[PDB]
């Protein structure tokens, strides 16, 4: 399990998870707050 | 006994060297009258992939 977690801690896996989280957050924000142009 | 102590950290003063103004570990100092007796090993390799070089007594400073 330690080796598997270390593999999950590698740069491509971490980048994939982080970008999926960031993209999901932005998509959900644009979904609940459609068409945001100004503050 | 001439030159820096073995295992100490020195700063390279050679302008054309890749490790100029960088810190490297002293490996060995030649006791003869060679031009570059100090042997310095670095953690970061240069463009050629080398991590060690030879420098003179005045080209290295204890830093």
């Amino acid at each position: 399990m330690k080796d598997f977690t270390t593999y999950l801690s590698t740069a491509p896996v971490i980048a994939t998870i982080w970008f999926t989280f960031t993209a999901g957050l932005l998509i959900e924000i644009n979904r609940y707050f459609p068409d945001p142009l100004v503050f | 006994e001439v030159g820096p102590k073995r295992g100490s950290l020195v700063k390279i003063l050679r302008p054309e060297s890749y490790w100029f103004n960088q810190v490297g570990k002293v490996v060995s100092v030649d006791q003869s009258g060679v031009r570059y007796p100090v042997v310095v090993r670095f953690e970061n390799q240069n463009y050629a992939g080398v991590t060690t070089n030879n420098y003179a007594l005045d080209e290295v400073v204890a830093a």
């Binding site: - | 003869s32 050629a48 070089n53």
Partner: protein, 80 residues
């Protein structure tokens, strides 16, 4: 012909001579290093300028330099 120069930072590792594909460099006795040898270029008329010797040099900066000069049949590596 190209200009090949050897500098005093040479450690006499003979790697540049072994990498030369046209037998331009050689080793001569010397006293400025532990190996007691120094690179030399006595046959620069046959140098083509491939710079393999510079690739094989481990000193920082290089101890052997090749400056491309006049071009001839030998320097251009022409077999015709």
């Amino acid at each position: 012909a190209h200009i090949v120069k050897i500098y005093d930072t040479c450690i006499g590792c003979t790697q540049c001579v072994r990498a030369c594909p046209l037998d331009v460099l050689e080793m001569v006795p010397w006293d400025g290093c532990k190996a007691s040898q120094m690179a030399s270029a006595p046959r620069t008329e046959d140098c083509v300028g491939c710079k393999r010797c510079e690739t094989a040099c481990p000193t920082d900066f290089l101890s052997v330099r090749v400056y491309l000069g006049s071009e001839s049949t030998r320097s251009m590596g022409l077999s015709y």
